[PDB]
Each structure stands twice: as structure tokens, then as C-alpha cells.
Amino acid sequence: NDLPSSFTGYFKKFNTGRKIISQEILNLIELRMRKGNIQLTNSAISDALKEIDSSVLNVAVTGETGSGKSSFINTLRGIGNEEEGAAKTGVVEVTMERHPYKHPNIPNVVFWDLPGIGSTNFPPDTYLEKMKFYEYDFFIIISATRFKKNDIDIAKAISMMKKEFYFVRTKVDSDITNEADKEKVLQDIRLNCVNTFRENGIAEPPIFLLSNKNVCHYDFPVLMDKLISDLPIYKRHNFMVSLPNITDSVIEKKRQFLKQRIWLEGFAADLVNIIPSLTFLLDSDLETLKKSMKFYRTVFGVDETSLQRLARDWEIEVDQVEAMIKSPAVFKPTDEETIQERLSRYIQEFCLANGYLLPKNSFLKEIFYLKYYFLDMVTEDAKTLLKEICLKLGR
Ligand SMILES: Nc1nc2c(ncn2[C@@H]2O[C@H](COP(=O)(O)OP(=O)(O)O)[C@@H](O)[C@H]2O)c(=O)[nH]1
Ligand SMILES: [Mg+2]
């Protein structure tokens, strides 16, 4: 129940697949805290954060023309082929150049649309050299059918360089519709794929059947979860926040990663022995808080632009969508109450329901309790809209 134990003890609420930082680093930080190395302690936390924040992810998306590379890239960034930044889909024209696509709101996440190896006449290894294989964190190998020798030869060349790769079977929704009017058409699809793999001399590998048109369906959710799990721990945060907000589970998962960063950031800023009251609101902390709110809102898809997007799909005024959630009104000017009074209330509300999160008389600085409050609010808003977005589908 001492401070060092409370610091590491906080991460016990998140399982190994949801850790933003390794147990070895946490133990090392706790050791330094217990040894009294205040310098080394803040240095280790600060370095951990810098490594988390600066992590850049480069995903290589390959597969033959028509597989769904461009669509996959759009789907992962949560954008339509129409939106700006989209990787145009249905492009048949041959190309020999890789094309980068950054997540619209997370610059540190970059997807590379690589031309199918078949489109080029490059042998597996030359293809990888030409595509600069060394720049990628992992490869997504897409097939809309049952995979072919080219896909496996690329994977074999990738494993030989000890890089991660995932076999993704797209268009399952097509096979389902074409074989109907759901059913285990998936079972057969997966079966044909395994035969192709066994056929190419390898043990049955993991296969993700999915539809770029329905991110909430099939193996898309487990794939996104597996990508995060397999990623070196420090890279998880940045990629996790860029992922599609498909279910309450994924939303909660984003919240868990964000809560851990607030905690690290809070300890890095130094704890205090004064209760959080926000008697005064510095303009600097106010600007920081406004930036945190905008970031959280963007991450969970409840930012201005996103709410505007929903204002389209739903033939209603943006004002009405905003009325459905809470985060949009936090910084909306009002003559009836100052921002300081509002944030002071939030802190009191937060600490009453959550406590101070630390041993008696130890507290995080006020701005962090506000970040936690903002995070819960936005995550709630996200679940609210998602509830409507999905159920309103009907298909
Ligand atoms: N039904 C369905 N169509 C898909 C899927 N993925 C891609 N497509 C479509 O199939 C075509 C080829 O996709 P595209 O993403 O441009 O793949 P690329 O040529 O490999 O980069 C386009 O008409 C897409 O809209 C999917 O999962 N389901
Ligand atoms: Mg394409």
C-alpha cells in the first residue's frame, strides 16, 4: 500500500495484452522508487513515455490486384473510399510503386499499399527488396480467394527475415451473399485456404476471414486484437488509438491504454499532497485540457468532424447529435457558469466516485483527474453513439 506498490499496482487492472509498458520496465521503475533514486525514477518513466509517444508504425499491405489492399487500408483508418486520404479502391491499372497512407488523425500510423507481386515480375526476395521490407513492422497478406503460391512465397521470405505477417481472407461477405437467397460458408472458405497452405509445404497458419465492408463482422475484430497483442509493447498505444471503434469492448480497450498513459504522465509530473480543487485554472492547463479533450474525442470518433459525418448519415442537425452526448458541451461558452466552475465540479465528481487513486494524502495534480474524467465522458459518449450507429444499421 506504499507509493511504489500503488504505482505498479495500478497496471494490475490491465491484462498482459492491454499493457502499455512491460512488467520488466515497471519492476525497474518500482526498484528505483524503492531505492530512492528520484532522478532515475523520473528518467525511466519519462523515457518510457517518450518511447510510447514517438512510436511510428509502418504496415505493409500486399496481395494480388483486386484482393482488397486499398479497401483494407481505408477500413483500418476508418475512412470511406470517398473521404480525403482514402486509398482509391477498384484500381486495376498496374503499378510498381508502394504508396503510403497515414491514419487521418494518427500520423504515427502508416499503411503501405504495395502492388501485388504478380503485377510485378519480381521474385519474392527482389520484391521485398524493391518494397523496402525492412521499414515494416508487420505485413498483411491479403487474398480474396484461397491464397496462392505468391502469397505464401512472400510470407516464407518474410519469416526468413523474422518479420510478422498475417494472412487475411477478404470478401467473405460476397461468398456469403452469393451462396444465399451467416451460414458456414466460412467453414469451407477457411478449409480451402488451409489446403492451399498445406499444399505449399507449411503448417496450417492463422487465417483471418473478414469483410472490408463490415469491420464489426467475422474475424476483423480478432485480427485487430491480435495485431495489438503481437506488437512490441511500446508500439501498442499509438496503433491502438487509431483502430476502428467497433464495439464497447474495443472502446474500453482504448480507454485502458489511455488510462495507463495518464497514470505514467501523472507520476512523471510529480505527485502532490494537496487535494485536487482547481481553485484557479491556469490558461496553460486549460489549453492542455482542451487539447486532451480534442484528442480523446478524435480517438473515440466523437470529435466535431465525426459528429458532422453522423449529421449526414442521419438526416438531422449536428446540434441534435451533440445533444446526444456530453463531451461537445464541456468547452462550449456559457454566461451561466465559468470553465473553472465546471472543471472544479468535474474533479469533485470524479474523486467522489473514484477516490484519489492513491494512498491517503498523495494525489495526482488536478489536470490528470480532469483527463481521467474527460476520458470516461468521451468513452461513454462513444458507446452511446456506437449503440445507435450499429443497431440503426439493420442491414
Ligand atoms: N464485398 C466486398 N468487396 C470488397 C472487399 N474488399 C475489397 N472489396 C472490393 O473489391 C474490389 C477490389 O478491392 P481493392 O481494395 O481496390 O483491392 P486492391 O486492388 O488489392 O488494392 C473493389 O471493388 C472493392 O470495393 C470485401 O471485404 N468485401
Ligand atoms: Mg489498390
Dump the DSSP string for 209-240: E--TT-TTSTTHHHHHHHHHHHS-HHHHHHHH
Candidates 324, 306, 285, 111; CA nearest to 212 is 111
Residue 312 neighbours by CB under 8 Å, 6+ apart: none
CB 279 within 8 A of CB 358: no
Residue ranges, CATH 3.40.50.300, the chain: 56-231
C-alpha grid cell, residue 346: 468535474
Nearest atom in ligand 1 to the alpha carbon of residue 88 is 16
Instruction: Give the Å distance between the CA of 66 and the centre of ligand 1.
Output: 6
Residue in the structure block whose three cell numbers are 466552475: 341
Q: Is 266 annotated as a binding residue?
A: no
How far are the Cα atoms of 178, 253, 297 from residue 306, in angstroms, in the given order?
Answer: 33, 20, 9
The reply, when asked if residue 27 is annotated as ligand binding, is no
Distance from C-alpha of 280 to C-alpha of 62, rounded to nearest angstrom: 54
Alpha-carbon gap, residue 158 to 302, rounded angstroms: 38
Q: Cα(303)–Cα(307) distance, rounded to whole angstroms? A: 6
Resolution in A: 2.0
Return the C-alpha cell found at 392: 440503426
Q: Which residue has a Cα nearest atom 7 of ligand 1? A: 68
Please tell me what DSSP assigns to residue 272: B
Task: Give the up-direction half-sphere exposure of residue 68: CA atoms within 13 A in the CB hemisphere.
Answer: 23
Q: Measuring CA to CA, how many Å separate 162 from each of 114, 137, 251, 378?
A: 19, 11, 32, 39
Experimental method: X-ray
Dihedrals φ, ψ of 165, to 5°? -145, 145
Ligand 1 geometric centre to CA of 71 (Å): 6
Ligand 1 pocket test: pick from 212, 220, 395 the residue with the most ligand atoms within 8 Å of its Cβ: 212
Residue type, 174: S
CA of 39 relative to ligand 1 center, distance in Å: 53
89 assigned to a ligand binding site: yes
Do 144 and 171 meet the contact criterion of CB atoms below 8 Å apart? yes
C-alpha cell of residue 246: 467497433
344 lines ligand 1 (CB under 6 A): no
| 46 appears as a binding residue in the annotation | no
Tell me which residue has cell 509530473.
269
H helices present in the chain, as ranges:
3-9, 23-35, 38-54, 69-76, 124-130, 149-159, 172-178, 185-199, 220-230, 233-242, 248-268, 283-299, 304-313, 318-323, 339-354, 366-391
Rounded to 5°, the CA angle 314-315-317 comes to 95
Distances (CA, A) of 389 to 4, 105, 246, 312: 43, 21, 10, 12
Cβ of 74 below 6 Å from ligand 1: no
72 alpha carbon – ligand 2 mean position (Å)? 9
- The answer to whether domain 56-231 has CATH 3.40.50.300 is yes
- Which among 59, 71, 175 is the best mutation to test ligand 1's pocket, defined by most ligand atoms within 8 Å of the CB? 71
CB count within 10 Å of CB 109 equals 24
Q: Using CA atoms, how far apart are residues 57 and 367, in angstroms rounded to an integer?
A: 29
For the Cβ of 173 lying below 6 angstroms from any atom of ligand 1, the answer is yes
CA distance linking residue 262 with residue 364, whole number of Å: 10
What number does the ligand 1 atom closest to the CA of 63 have? 20
Helix crossing, 283-299 with 366-391: angle to 10°? 30
306 annotated ligand-binding residue: no
